[PDB]
Each structure stands twice: as C-alpha cells, then as structure tokens.
Design a protein around this ligand. Structure first.
Ligand SMILES: CSc1ccc2c(c1)[C@@H](N1CCN(C)CC1)Cc1ccccc1S2
Ligand SMILES: CSc1ccc2c(c1)[C@@H](N1CCN(C)CC1)Cc1ccccc1S2
Lengths: 383, 382
C-alpha cells in the first residue's frame, strides 16, 4: 500500500489544486452561463432549450457537488471527510454524471421526434413533456446510485481512509456501468447515425427539388409553345409543393420563416405565370421566368443555408465524439483495473470524464449562433 | 450495385469451399465435445453439462446458421423468402446469444465454485446447471422475439433497424452486457486465484525460513518459538482452502491427501515440541531434517496450483478470442449507418461465427481429457 501522492512534490501539488479548482470553476461559470442565457432570453424559452438548460444544471452540479471535493481527494490521496460524505459524494457523482448522459439522449430523442414525427410531435411537445423527460433522467440516475447503499447495512466502520465505488456485487458493477454509460451512449451513437442520414436525405430531397425548379426555369425560357411552359410550371408546382413538405427544424430563425414564406411567394409566382399563359401571353411568362430567377436569387442563395442545418447535426456528433473520449477511457480502464502509477491514470480519466461537464457547454457556444452572440455580447467583443 | 457480381466464379467457389469447411469444422468440433462428455463417465458433472450445452449451441450455428450464411455471403442475394429470413435471424441471434450466456453461466459456476466454494458445492446439482441452461436459451429467444412481435402490427436478409430502441437493447442485452459480465467475472477469479496461490506461496516461505532457523537454532526457546509459528501456519493454511480442489469436489481424494498431509506435518511439530519439554533439542533437529523430506514430497505434488491459475487463464483465452471474434462486428455495426464497406461487415460476421469453431478447439487444446480423447479417435498413438 503505497500512495503515489506522497512522491509528488509541494510545487506540483499546488499547481494541481490551482489547475483543478480552475477546471472546477471554468465548469461552474460555463454551465451557469448557459442556464442564465436561456432563462433571461424570452426568445429562447422552448422545450428544446429547457433540456439544454437542465443539461447545464447537471454539469453545474458536477462542478459543485463532485468536482471540488475530487480536487481535494485527487491531489492529497486521502479521504478526510468520512463515510456519510463518501456516500453522497459517489451518489451525486454517479447520479449527476449519469443524468448528463441521459440529458444528451433525451435531447437527441427530441431531435429525433422533431424530424421523423415533425408533424406529430410539434403538437405533443410541451414544456410538460420536456419536464417529465428531465424528471425521469434524474430519477433514473438516482436509482443507479441507490443500489450500493441498500446493501451497506451489514458492515459499519467508524473511520474511513478511501472513497471508491463498491466492487462487492459484480451484478451491480456491470448493471451500473452499462445502464449508466454503455446503454445510453450506444443509444446516442445510434440516434446520431439515424439523424445524420435523415439530414443527408432531406438535403438531397430539396437539392433535387431545386434542380427541378432550376431546369424548368430554363425550359420556360427556351420553350416555344404554351404547352411546354405549363409542363414546366406543373413540374415546378409539384416540386415546390413537395419541397414545402420537408422543412428543417429548437428556435426557428427569422431567416427560416423567410424561406418558407419564400416558398409561398414562389408558389404564388408559379400560380401567376400559369394565369399568364391562360391570358395567352407566353413571351411574358418567359419574362415571369426572369422574375422567378430574381426570387430565386433572393431566397435560394439564402436557402444555400439548409446546407448549414446539416452541419448543425455534426455538432451533436462532436458532442458525442468528445463525450466518448472523455468518459469511455474511464470505462475501458475501470474493468481492466482489478487485473492491472496505474492508480494515477485511473484518477486521470475520472477528471477527463468530468472534463465533459466543461466541454458540453463550450461546444454549444462555439456551435450554436444564439449562444455565440450572447457570448460576444457579455464580454463585448462584437457590438 | 452488389459487389458479389464483380467477384469472379473461381473465387466464389473457393469461398463456398472455405465457409463450408468452417461450417463443417464447427459441426465436427462441437460434436466431438458433446460426444466425449456423454461417453466419458469421468466427465459427467454439472460443470461439463454446461460445457456440453455450449457446444450444442455452437453446433446449432454450424447447422441452422452457417450453411445458410455460406450461400447468402458468396452470392450476395437471399433467394429463400420471408419466412426463412425470419427463422434464420431468429436462430442466429438466439444461438449466438446463448453461446455468450452459456459462457457467463460457466464463469458464474466458476465464481460460485471458488468464492462460495463451501456453500455452492451442495447447491450445485445437475438440476441447478440445467435450469441455468434453460434460462440461457429462453433469454436468447426473447431477444429474437421482439422484431416479429412488432412486424405483426404493421431479396435481402438483415436485422430490423426500425426500432432504435431494440437495435440497442438487443446489441447490449445480448452482447455488451454479458460480455462485460464475463470480463468482470474473469478479473474477479483471476485475482481470486492469484490470492489463494499467494496465501500458500507465503506459507511455503514461512516453513522454509523456520527450517533454516531450526537448522541454525542453538536453543529450546528459539526452537519452540519456531515450532509454534509453523503449527499456526498449518492451522491458518487450513482456514484457506486450495483453488484447484475447490473446483474439484471438496471431499476429493487429492484434497484429503493435502489435509491429512497437514495433520501429519502438525503431528510432527507436536512431537518436537514435546521433545523440548523432555529436554532433548538436537533430537528435534534430527526431527527437523525429517520434516524437510516429508514436506518436499507433499509440496511438490501440491505444487499444481501453478496449474489452477493457468486453468483460469484458458477462460481468459476464450474471453480473449470470443471478443476478438464478435467485437469487430459490434464495433463496425454502430459505425456502418454513417460510413466496399459491406464486404468487411460480412467478414466480421463470419469472424464472429468463427468463434463457434474456436470455442471447442480451445477445450481440446486446453483440457487434457479431450486431447487424449482426440489422439485416441484418429489413432495418433502407437
Ligand atoms: C465500473 S466503476 C463505475 C461504474 C459506474 C459509474 C461510474 C464508475 C462513474 N464514476 C465516475 C468517477 N467517480 C469517481 C465515481 C463514479 C462514471 C460515470 C460517468 C458518467 C455517467 C455515469 C457514470 S456511473
Ligand atoms: C446491431 S446488428 C445486431 C444486433 C444484435 C445482434 C446481432 C446483430 C447478431 N447478428 C449477427 C449476424 N447475423 C447475421 C444476425 C445476428 C450478432 C450477435 C452475436 C452474438 C450474440 C448475439 C448477437 S445479437
């Protein structure tokens, strides 16, 4: 029994409490940054952003209930706080960190329902629905941490020298590891590959509907009779109609209302250029095609931003990517620990795992343009 | 565009040849085991009954799954229709699931055989082994049952991706959960074995040093002090039961020989203590020379514990191979939806099936009962 913390000198001990309390703080500020931004901004009050808020709540509770106590226990190498504190430290640590994974999946589940059931769930999605999901996330995270302590009743010790999870029951060693990490993690990897292709699909959908509207504008311009024109317009009508069915979705930006109003305008123009041929004016419908092209240049160069909506999916992929690299090495290494300086690196991937609670809100700021401007506004880098 | 069409007929033939070889080798290997168990009277145990039902499982892969797979892989098309695609996946999922869970039920028996060695030796019957077999199959079934329960409501054969819920639940409950169970049950028993060898490897160091002492000892106080600690070492060696024999029957003939061997050696310590009371010391040093000869014969024979830890390691090679077989399938399966690629996905499916071959061949290579059973069959020995 040799604690390696003793070999590490006082200069580095200080640097490490400094560094870890920095991380602890950086996490306390970043997640507080998000929760305030959501609550204060009326624009952002959505069942979508509540999940994002309750995620930062969770990651904030790591920087509060877990991370500073870890800061002590990691640097020192001994647990001075006793048994009942060792209890709630692990309980909160598993529960918070569990809830942060399950808030991610409840987020991606809402994003799954926002697309596939876009028609259905837009009515179903209330704050109550977002709230009940949040409640079950915490409640599950609790009942993951609840089993170790029900069993602890047989032995009682006056003094405590160390605080790590119970390895007595293998049953709840696996159950926790999987139920808390593996299961909802693999869930998110599945919900990403799901929605990544969904985005890839609906963009090919509308890009093909654009090639319809693009080529048929060339047809109307080049068509020498009234029949080839209406033929183009009828294929443009059914294309704009089909394109309308598929919509990108969370705060729906003013620009996006403008591309949907850009379609109702465009369909308004297809209805007029048909009335123009009914009036018998063909070379006018070829001037109405010069018109549609200007509406195209107005709204569709702006629609070259549905291409951004697909990239807004990739950012959740980067969360998933970061999330994994953070926690997985812990869960890789934790199972090999009994067989396998080594205890130093186990302590490391716990912090690397806690580092997710920092990394989750900073991504939203970098990725999401709502928060980035909220961010630029606070420090005043952008007027 | 299906790439099976680009692959030429000569290689098509080599691949049905290779896969049907694997299909056969698996049909042969697992039948080899099941026959050996039933036929050998020595081997009839609830322990090997589990080992048999594992080979049963792996045999059903070489039957229900592998020859049908052999076709669908080489051609690239499923000609057999809907109701066949149903039972092919059902059997494939159920068998391959049962093979992971027969492994864990094996390691669960090995866990209860060691840690609860006192308790479970009475609890372990064939009935106890059998009910476990049943729940293994039953679980494996109810993993394959949901796709079909749900399709009732509403050219190629692959698993249902409609419910992401049961895409995951199946992937985890059938593979990830019990695999991680086995990795945990191995790290459990690997250290458990390391512990019981270290206990008695330390007891060896006690009785060795105290023999140096008594050989270098000049007094009755120093000798009797040595003898008391040698007695209590044998008594404290008796609280700890040995791992090779805990997996055996607790009352085995080999076990009584090491416990009676302790009673002999302690009986020898009782005379050399009584010898010091009479005032005879250098006679106890003729008695100490006597102790060394007896101890070496008994300890070199019990030095088969170097073997018990290694008999655990053979499950470690199974766990190791098993994972290397199936994991790449489960690595790739999650990356497939996003990410020529379908060629290698088909490959780790066969590499996964290759486990059904690799499981019984290990028992032969590892277990010395089968190795001799094998040499006898083919007439390897003159
Ligand atoms: C096999 S040991 C094990 C099993 C389950 C869980 C953990 C560790 C948990 N640790 C983290 C480190 N902390 C010092 C103790 C609790 C890791 C985690 C992370 C995120 C969500 C849920 C969980 S549950
Ligand atoms: C995400 S796709 C998926 C999900 C669950 C399972 C499989 C595949 C299973 N495959 C293998 C290939 N075979 C053609 C069909 C069944 C693989 C396997 C292997 C061992 C034990 C249980 C299982 S259950």
């Amino acid at each position: 029994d040799y604690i390696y913390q003793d070999s590490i000198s006082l200069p580095w001990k200080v640097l490490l409490v400094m560094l870890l309390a920095l991380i602890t703080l950086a996490t306390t500020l970043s997640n507080a940054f998000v929760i305030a931004t959501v609550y204060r901004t009326r624009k952002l009050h959505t069942p979508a952003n509540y999940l994002i808020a309750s995620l930062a709540v969770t990651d904030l509770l790591v920087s509060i209930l877990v991370m500073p106590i870890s800061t002590m226990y990691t640097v020192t190498g001994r647990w001075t706080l006793g048994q009942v504190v060792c209890d709630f430290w692990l309980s909160s640590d598993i529960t918070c960190c569990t809830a942060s994974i399950w808030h991610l999946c409840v987020i991606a589940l809402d994003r799954y329902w926002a697309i596939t059931d876009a028609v259905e769930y837009s009515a179903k999605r209330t704050p109550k629905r977002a709230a009940v999901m949040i409640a079950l996330v915490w409640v599950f995270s609790i009942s993951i941490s609840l089993p170790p302590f029900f069993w602890r009743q047989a032995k009682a010790e006056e003094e405590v020298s160390e605080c790590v999870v119970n390895t007595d029951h293998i049953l709840y060693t696996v159950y926790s590891t999987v139920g808390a990490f593996y299961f909802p993690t693999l869930l998110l990897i599945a919900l990403y590959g799901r929605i990544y292709v969904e985005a890839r699909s609906r963009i090919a959908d509308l890009e093909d509907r654009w090639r319809t509207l693009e080529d048929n504008l060339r047809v109307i311009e080049r068509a020498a009779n009234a029949a080839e024109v209406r033929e183009a317009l009828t294929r443009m009508r059914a294309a704009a109609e089909d394109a309308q069915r598929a919509t990108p979705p969370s705060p729906a930006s003013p620009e996006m209302e403008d591309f949907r109003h850009g379609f109702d305008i465009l369909v308004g123009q297809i209805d007029d250029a048909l009335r123009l041929a009914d009036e018998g004016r063909v070379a006018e419908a070829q001037a109405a095609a010069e018109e549609l092209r200007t509406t195209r240049n107005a709204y569709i160069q702006k629609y070259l931003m549905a291409a951004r909506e697909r990239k807004a999916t990739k950012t959740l992929g980067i969360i998933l990517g970061a999330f994994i690299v953070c926690w997985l090495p812990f869960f890789i290494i934790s199972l090999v620990m009994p067989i396998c300086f080594h205890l130093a690196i186990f302590d490391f991937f716990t912090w690397l795992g806690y580092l997710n609670s920092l990394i989750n809100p900073i991504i939203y700021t970098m990725s999401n343009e709502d928060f980035k401007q909220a961010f630029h506004k606070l420090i005043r880098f952008k007027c």
